[model samples]
Target: DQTYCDRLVQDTPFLTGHGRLSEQQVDRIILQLNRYYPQILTNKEAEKFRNPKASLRVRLCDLLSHLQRSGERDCQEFYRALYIHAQPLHSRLPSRH
Candidate 1:
C-alpha cells in the first residue's frame, strides 16, 4: 500500500506552491518531520489539499499548527506532507501566452 510518505514524495509541483519555498525550508521541515513523526499524515488526506480550487497554503498552515498543538502522529504527518507540498507557484509566474 502507498503510505503517506510514498504519496508525499510522489507529489508534483502542481499540488505544492510550485516549488516556491526555498530548498532550505523544504529540507528543514521534511527532515524535522521525518525524524520526529513520520506516520501521522496520510496520502488520502494530503491529496485533498491539492485540489486546484482549494486554498492549499491556508489549509496547510492550519494543519501544521494543529499538529504542533496536538502532537498527534497523524496530524504531524499530514502537515509534513502539506509542507512538503506547500508552494506558491500559482501566483508567481507571468501569464501564459
Candidate 2:
C-alpha cells in the first residue's frame, strides 16, 4: 500500500495545459487531491490515478465519475490528492500563475 501511496505521490505530471503553476499553487492542488481521494476512491484505485502519466484533466474527469458513483462519497479526499500531487510540478511548470 505504501508503494502505491508513493507512486500516487510521484505519478502526477507538472503541466496544467492552461499554463504553468506556482509552487504554492501546486502544493495546494496536491494537498486537495490527496484529501479527496480517500473519501471518493478506494486506496488501490487512488494509487493508480496517482501515476505521473495521468493527466489532471483525466483525473478530474475520473473524480467527477467517482462523485457520480456515490452521493455519500467524501469530496475532500479528491481535493487532498490533487493538492499533494501538484506539488512536484509546481516548480517545473513552464509558466507561473
All candidates: TM-score: 0.33, 0.38
In Å, residue 67's CA in model 1 sits off its true spot by: 1.6
- How far off is residue 50 in model 1, in Å? 2.2
The TM-score of predicted model 1 comes to 0.33
Task: Point out where model 1 deviates above 4 Å.
Answer: 1-37, 72-97
lDDT minimum window of 10 residues, candidate 1: 88-97
Local distance difference test, per candidate? Answer: 0.43, 0.45
lDDT comparing candidate 2 with the true structure: 0.45
Highest lDDT scorer: 2
Whole-model lDDT, model 1 = 0.43
- Lowest-sum lDDT 10-residue window in model 2: 1-10
